[PDB]
Every structure is written in structure tokens, then in C-alpha cells.
Amino acid sequence: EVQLVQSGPELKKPGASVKVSCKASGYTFTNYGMNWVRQAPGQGLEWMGWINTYTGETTYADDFKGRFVFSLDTSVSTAYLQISSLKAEDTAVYYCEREGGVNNWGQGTLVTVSSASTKGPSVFPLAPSSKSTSGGTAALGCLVKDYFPEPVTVSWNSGALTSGVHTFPAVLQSSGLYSLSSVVTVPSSSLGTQTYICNVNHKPSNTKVDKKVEPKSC
Amino acid sequence: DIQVTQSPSSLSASVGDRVTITCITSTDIDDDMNWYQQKPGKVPKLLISGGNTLRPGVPSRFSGSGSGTDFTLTISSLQPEDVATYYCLQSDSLPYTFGQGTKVEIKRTVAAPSVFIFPPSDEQLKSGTASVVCLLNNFYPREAKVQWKVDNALQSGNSQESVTEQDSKDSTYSLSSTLTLSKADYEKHKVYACEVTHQGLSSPVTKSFNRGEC
Amino acid sequence: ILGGREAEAHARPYMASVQLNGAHLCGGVLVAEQWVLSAAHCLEDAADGKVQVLLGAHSLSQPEPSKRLYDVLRAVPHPDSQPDTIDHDLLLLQLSEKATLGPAVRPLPWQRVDRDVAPGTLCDVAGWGIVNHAGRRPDSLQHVLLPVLDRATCNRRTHHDGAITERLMCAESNRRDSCKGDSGGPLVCGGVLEGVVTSGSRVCGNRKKPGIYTRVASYAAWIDSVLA
Numbered sequence: 001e002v003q004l005v006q007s008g009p010e011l012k013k014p015g016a017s018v019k020v021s022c023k024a025s026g027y028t029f030t031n032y033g034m035n036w037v038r039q040a041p042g043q044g045l046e047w048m049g050w051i052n053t054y055t056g057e058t059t060y061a062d063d064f065k066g067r068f069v070f071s072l073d074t075s076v077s078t079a080y081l082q083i084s085s086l087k088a089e090d091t092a093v094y095y096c097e098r099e100g101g102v103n104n105w106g107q108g109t110l111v112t113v114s115s116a117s118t119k120g121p122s123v124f125p126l127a128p129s130s131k132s133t134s135g136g137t138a139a140l141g142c143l144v145k146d147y148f149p150e151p152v153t154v155s156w157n158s159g160a161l162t163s164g165v166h167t168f169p170a171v172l173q174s175s176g177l178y179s180l181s182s183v184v185t186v187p188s189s190s191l192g193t194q195t196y197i198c199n200v201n202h203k204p205s206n207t208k209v210d211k212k213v214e215p216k217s218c
Numbered sequence: 219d220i221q222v223t224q225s226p227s228s229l230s231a232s233v234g235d236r237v238t239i240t241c242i243t244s245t246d247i248d249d250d251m252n253w254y255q256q257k258p259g260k261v262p263k264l265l266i267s268g269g270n271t272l273r274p275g276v277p278s279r280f281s282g283s284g285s286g287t288d289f290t291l292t293i294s295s296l297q298p299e300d301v302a303t304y305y306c307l308q309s310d311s312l313p314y315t316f317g318q319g320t321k322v323e324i325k326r327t328v329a330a331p332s333v334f335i336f337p338p339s340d341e342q343l344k345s346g347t348a349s350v351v352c353l354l355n356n357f358y359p360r361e362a363k364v365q366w367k368v369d370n371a372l373q374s375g376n377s378q379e380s381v382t383e384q385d386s387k388d389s390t391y392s393l394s395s396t397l398t399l400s401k402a403d404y405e406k407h408k409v410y411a412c413e414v415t416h417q418g419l420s421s422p423v424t425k426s427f428n429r430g431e432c
Numbered sequence: 433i434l435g436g437r438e439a440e441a442h443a444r445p446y447m448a449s450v451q452l453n454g455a456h457l458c459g460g461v462l463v464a465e466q467w468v469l470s471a472a473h474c475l476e477d478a479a480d481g482k483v484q485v486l487l488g489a490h491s492l493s494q495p496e497p498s499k500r501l502y503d504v505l506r507a508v509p510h511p512d513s514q515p516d517t518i519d520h521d522l523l524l525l526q527l528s529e530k531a532t533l534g535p536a537v538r539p540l541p542w543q544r545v546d547r548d549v550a551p552g553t554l555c556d557v558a559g560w561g562i563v564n565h566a567g568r569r570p571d572s573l574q575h576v577l578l579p580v581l582d583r584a585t586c587n588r589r590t591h592h593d594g595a596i597t598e599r600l601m602c603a604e605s606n607r608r609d610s611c612k613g614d615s616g617g618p619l620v621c622g623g624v625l626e627g628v629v630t631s632g633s634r635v636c637g638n639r640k641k642p643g644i645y646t647r648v649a650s651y652a653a654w655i656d657s658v659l660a
Contacts, residue, residue: 032594033584035314037262044319045254045262045305050312054584055551061313062219095261100587101594103264103273124342126351129432131425132334139334143342143349143396166355166392168380173398180380181394183353185332218432248640250590267589309590310640 002026004096004106008203011112011149017084020109022096029077030054033099036070036081039108040092050099051079086113112149112204116176120207121147123200126181127216133188140213141183142198146175147205154182155199161186191215220244222308224317232325233389237293239320241306243286251289252307253282254316258383266291268309298324301384324389330418331357331393333425337432338404348404350397352412352425356390363415364395367426369407373397404429433559434637435608436576441490442498444558446540446625447573449486450525450616451501452478456492456569459559459617460485461625462539464659465530469542470616471630471646472509472523483507485525488536491572492560498536503528508658510651518595521630521646523616524658540618542625543649548601551582555603555621557629557643561613562636569613578603578610580621581642590640599650601627603643610643611636619645 007021022034036048049060051070058070069082079096090113096106126132126141133139144152154167167182182198192215200209221244231237241251253266264273270282279294293300301324306317331354338348354362360381366373376399382392395412411426439447448460448468458474468485475483488498506526513520531537549555558575562568586602587594596602603610603619610617610629619627627645635641648655 028598031583031596031598032587044303045256045307045316047307047314047316050314052582052584054582059312061315097262099584100589100592103267105261108261122342122345124339124349126336127339127432129336131427131432132336132353134332134334139332139353139355141336141351141353143339143351145342145349166382168382168392168394171378171380173378179349179378179396181351181353181396183355183392183394185355216432218430250640252589267593309588311590 002098002102002104004098004104006096006106006109009110009112009149009151011114011118011204012086013115014087014113016086017082018086018111020081020094020111022079022081022106024077024079024098029074032101034070034079035097035099037095037097038092039095040089053079083111088113110151114149116148118205119146119148119177120202120205121145121152121200121209123198123209123211125211125213126183127213128191129216134185136188137185138188138191139183139185140196141181142200142211142213143179143181144200145179146173146177147202148177149204150178151203152180153201156182156184157197158199161196219313220247220308220310220315222306222315222317224306224320226320227318228321228323230323230325231296233296233298235296237296237322239291239304239306241289241308241317243289243308243310245310246286247308247310249285250308250310251282251284252309253291254305254307255302256305257302257386262305296324298389299386301386301389323384326358326389328418329356329358329390331355331362331414331416333412333414333423335410335412335425335427337410337427337429343401343404346401348399348401350399350410352395352397354393354395354414354416356385356388356392357416357418358390359417360391361417362393364393365413365415366395366397367409367411367413369409433557433561433570433574433576433614434563434611436563436574439490439558439573439575441572442488442536444573445488445536445538446618447489447558449489449492449560450474451484451486452481454482454484456560456613458613458615459561459629460525461618461628462487462531462537463542463625463655464539465533466527467659468525468527469628469648469655470523470525471521471628472513473515473521473630473632474523474616475507475509476515485527487531488534489573493571498534500532500537502531510654518600518630518632518644519597520651522628522651522654524655540620540625542655544652546649546652548583549580549621549626551580553580553621554578555580555619555626557603557610557614557617557619559610559614559617559629561615561617561631562611565637576608578608578643586642591642592644596644599647601645601647603645604639605637605642606639607637609637
């Protein structure tokens with residue numbers, strides 16, 4: 001099947017440059033061009049331009065002319081996006097979209113442009129208590145505090161627990177570090193018998209934390 | 219570059235309603251209009267391609283119409299899972315161009331939040347900081363007010379709020395409110411209270427604990 | 433042929449008119465003495481009719497010394513072609529006998545090396561198909577030089593949206609194009625046959641729908657087998 005896999009998130013200082021990869025598989029890379037799309041945080045989709053994978057010819061949308069360069073490596077069936085002279089406003093998710101046929105997109109690449117340094121999060125349990133009990137239902141979670149840059153992924157029991165999960169959008173604290181909480185409402189009877197782990201992954205700092213969230217005694 | 223004007227910016231409608239979104243191009247573009255759906259934390263999904271062609275695995279409730287300049291996306295019977303931002307894209311020639319987007323929300327019955335309070339963990343206390351978390355779970359409408367009280371003293375400037383996107387199944391929101399204190403201030407006081415004001419609550423609800431309780 | 437001009441009489445000796453009850457139906461290319469290459473979809477709605485191949489023609493109506501109308505001994509479509517697909521749209525016609533060769537009747541060499549014609553390469557396409565959007569067919573043979581369009585550009589959603597395989601090729605269609613009645617006809621690049629027109633129900637002369645041609649080199653072994 002068709003697959004488009006992009007490189008991981010990156011943090012770059014202003015004035016620096018970044019190279020995002022879009023590895024294509026399951027089809028003839030030269031039969032279809034590659035489109036580039038940007039999505040700044042909380043903004044709309046922006047068609048950046050296209051690269052013809054057969055000829056290497058490029059077409060850029062007006063806003064994207066200059067600092068943005070599309071390139072290819074046909075031998076590894078990879079399309080690249082190079083952004084030079086990075087600035088704060090370039091902080092966005094960058095997607096590759098294969099042009100034509102059954103519509104396929106890469107998963108996106110979060111690029112953060114900041115002078116602030118990488119920090120892995122500290123994971124703290126939000127233990128299920130009688131405060132958080134709802135008759136037969138119990139709320140528990142994880143506080144994913146003090147990390148930079150975004151993103152972090154939170155899953156419950158290695159992806160097995162999805163029902164009732166609310167992973168809150170991150171907020172930027174006064175410190176310039178992100179924080180968020182991920183909560184899950186589960187039956188109370190399940191506690192003690194079934195264990196609850198939050199799997200926190202922060203790729204920019206290569207931090208993977210697996211925190212057991214257990215009930216506590218006063 | 220071809221210009222596109224998407225309308226409206228946002229709308230709210232009930233389950234079963236008909237949603238109508240429009241895109242007007244700066245030139246005659248024939249049939250070459252596309253429509254994309256983007257859910258909260260997901261990659262864009264192409265719903266309709268040129269000629270108003272429905273794509274595989276896209277429900278029949280989605281349809282396109284229009285030619286030349288005036289294009290319309292129609293969701294004939296709005297479903298909870300349809301909550302997302304919708305974008306049109308003109309593909310007449312290169313470079314292609316997106317519309318500004320239309321955020322689509324579901325108007326549903328008023329649901330009261332279920333309120334939970336979490337004292338800071340013993341582990342966090344070690345580090346020299348205390349986070350008190352308040353959870354307002356599965357409520358409708360979006361608008362909610364959270365007030366923090368430490369030993370019955372109203373707080374300001376030391377709390378941050380975060381709201382989820384509308385749930386794809388029940389159309390509710392959830393909210394976290396975090397009170398940030400030093401370990402010194404946290405160990406100084408006893409009563410930590412989270413007061414919630416929401417349309418689904420007759421009178422404001424308070425969820426609280428005393429330092430040293432679970 | 434849209435946005436083209438009249439071909440010099442008999443300058444393409446390989447050019448054939450595939451006929452149904454004495455009316456031009458499709459273009460064709462003499463590839464051997466007794467064999468004409470055309471498209472399989474040409475024979476789709478014929479069944480009852482008299483299928484014939486006219487060689488050494490310039491004018492369809494007017495008598496010319498070289499004009500000879502040949503009956504069809506055998507009709508060999510590609511075994512994998514069928515009515516619902518543009519795939520393998522090739523047809524080998526066996527004439528009633530070997531063709532009377534001369535200055536106006538001569539077979540054309542076809543591309544054997546299976547490698548794409550470079551994008552931009554100017555190719556020649558001839559036929560007795562429609563010359564305008566009103567459906568007007570010409571009396572005499574028309575032609576047009578067309579630049580080869582790369583597969584990726586041709587596969588864009590605006591164009592053929594992934595329908596262009598490695599066995600198909602594209603040429604530009606902006607106000608200069610192959611059209612209805614040019615199907616089965618030749619696309620010649622540097623005197624060698626590279627493609628066989630496969631127009632179908634595609635709009636013509638519209639830059640948004642580039643011309644589609646079956647790459648002969650992809651079907652090298654099959655042509656050899658039928659001709660041997």
C-alpha cells in the first residue's frame with residue numbers, strides 16, 4: 001500500500017535552517033509529484049508549492065518564494081523541504097501530500113523556531129481518589145509538565161486504553177515551558193485489579209516515560 | 219496565484235441539520251474544486267475532488283456542487299463525528315490554493331460537567347512545586363468558569379486553563395484548570411477549592427480537599 | 433487533429449485508415465507488410481460491419497493512384513484488453529494479403545527499447561479525426577507536433593489523476609491535440625513510432641486533459657509474437 005512517512009519534530013534557533021524528509025513507499029515515486037502544506041498553530045492550511053518527482057521542476061506559492069526549497073533523492077524515493085533563515089513565524093506543522101490518485105498524506109512534522117533549549121517533561125500521576133470517584137466511575141491521569149518544544153504524545157496502557165481519554169492541549173507557562181494533563185475516566189471496580197500506565201513520548205528530548213498511576217492511601 | 223474566499227468562518231448546527239459551506243474563486247476554474255476535512259489532531263482528509271466527486275470511504279451525506287466560480291460543500295445530515303475544520307482547494311493550475319477554512323461545531327443539549335480535584339503528587343512536592351488540577355469532564359456548552367480558593371481566599375494569576383475539542387461521539391468538552399503554587403505556599407495552607415460555574419449547573423459547584431487527604 | 437495543419441500528401445507511407453462500412457473510424461500504422469497496428473476500443477461497437485484498412489491515402493473521398501482499400505483477414509486485439517479499461521489498448525490487423533508497397537505505402541519501425549521518451553521531445557501525430565469542437569472531420573490527412581508531457585505532471589488531479597501507468601505516455605493538449613477519430617493513430621518521435629493514440633471520451637484541445645498514447649515499447653514481446 002501507499003505510505004508517506006515524514007521525519008520527526010525539530011527545534012531550531014532563529015536564522016538557522018531545517019531539512020524535513022518525506023519518504024514515499026508502495027508506488028512508483030516518479031509517477032506522482034509531491035505537494036508541500038504548512039499549518040501554523042491554530043491557523044488554516046497553506047498550499048506551499050509542488051515538486052515534480054520525474055523532472056525536479058518546482059512551483060512555489062507567492063508567500064513561499066525564496067527561503068523554501070524543495071528537493072529530491074530518487075534513489076531513496078524521498079522528497080525534502082529545506083527552510084532557511086528560520087524565524088518564529090515558521091513554527092508550523094509541515095506536511096507532504098502526494099499529488100494525484102488515492103489521496104495520501106504524510107503524518108506531518110512539527111518544526112519549532114525558538115532560542116529556548118530542549119527540555120524533557122517530568123511526569124506526575126493524578127492518582128484516582130474518592131475526590132475523583134463518580135459513584136462507580138473513577139477519574140485518573142498524568143501531569144506532563146515542563147517540556148520544550150512541542151509535541152508530546154500520551155497514550156494509555158501502550159495504546160490499549162482509548163475510551164474516556166482526554167489529553168488536553170498544551171499551554172505555555174510563564175517559564176516558557178509547556179505543560180498539559182492527560183486524564184481517563186474508568187470504572188472504580190477496575191482499580192487495584194487492572195493497572196493504568198500513561199506512556200509519554202517527547203521525541204525532541206528522546207524521553208519516553210511509562211508512569212503507573214496507582215490509588216494512594218491517606 | 220488564484221485567490222479563494224471561503225465562507226462562513228465558523229458555524230454551529232444540530233445533529234441532522236444541513237451544513238452549507240461556500241468557496242468563490244478569483245477566476246473561472248471549471249470543475250477543479252476540492253474539499254478537505256481536518257479533525258482536531260489529524261491529517262487532512264480529501265472528501266470531494268474536481269467535478270464534485272465523492273472519495274472512497276467518505277459518507278454519502280457529503281456532496282459538492284458548483285462550476286466555474288461558485289462552489290458549495292453540503293453535509294446533508296450533520297453527525298457528531300463531522301465536527302472538524304473544512305477547507306476548499308482550487309486545483310485549476312499551479313500553485314493550488316486553499317480556502318480560509320470553516321470550523322463546524324455541534325449544537326447539542328446542555329450537559330453539566332462532572333468535577334474532579336487532584337492534589338499535587340508527593341513526587342512533585344520533592345521538586346519544589348505544587349500543581350493542583352481541576353477537571354471539568356464532558357460538558358456542553360463550551361463556556362465554563364473556574365475559580366480557585368486557597369483557605370477561602372480567591373486566587374488570581376496562578377492558574378491556567380485548557381479545553382479539549384468537541385468529542386466526536388457525545389459532542390461535549392472537557393476542561394483542565396491547573397493551580398500552580400510553590401511547595402512553600404502549598405505546605406503553608408490547608409483548604410484547596412475549585413469552584414465551577416456552568417449553564418448545566420443551577421448554582422456554582424465546589425470540589426475541594428484539605429492538604430493531606432486523598 | 434485539433435490545432436494542426438494538412439499533412440503533405442503521402443509523406444507518412446505508414447498511415448492507415450481503419451474503416452467501418454467505408455467510413456473512417458480509427459487511425460492506424462502499418463508495422464509489417466500484412467499488419468496494421470491500431471487500438472482495441474476501435475472495434476468495440478462494430479460487430480456487424482465490414483472492417484477494412486485503407487493504405488496510401490491522403491484524401492478519404494478522392495481517388496488517388498496509391499489508395500488501396502484492404503479487407504481484414506484477422507483481427508488480433510491485445511489478449512488483456514477489454515471494454516472497461518484503457519489498459520493494453522492495442523489491436524493488430526492482418527490484411528487480406530501482403531500490402532502493395534511503394535513510395536506512399538511502407539511500414540514504420542516501432543520503438544523496441546522500453547524507456548520513456550524524454551519530456552519536452554517534439555512528436556508528430558497524424559489522423560483523420562475531428563479538427564474542431566463542432567465535430568468537423570477533415571477530408572485530407574492532418575498532423576500536429578506535440579511536446580511530450582512527463583508522467584508526474586500528467587498524473588496531477590487536474591489532469592489524469594494517477595491513471596497514467598508506465599505503459600502509457602502523455603503529450604500536451606493546449607489547443608493542439610489528438611481527438612475523436614485519431615485513436616489507433618501514430619505518435620512518432622524522431623521517425624520511430626513511440627505511441628498509439630488512445631483518445632476515448634476525453635475532451636480535446638483542453639490543457640487540463642493531456643493526450644494519452646499507448647507506449648509500443650511496453651508491448652514489444654506481444655507485437656513480435658503476433659507478427660512472427
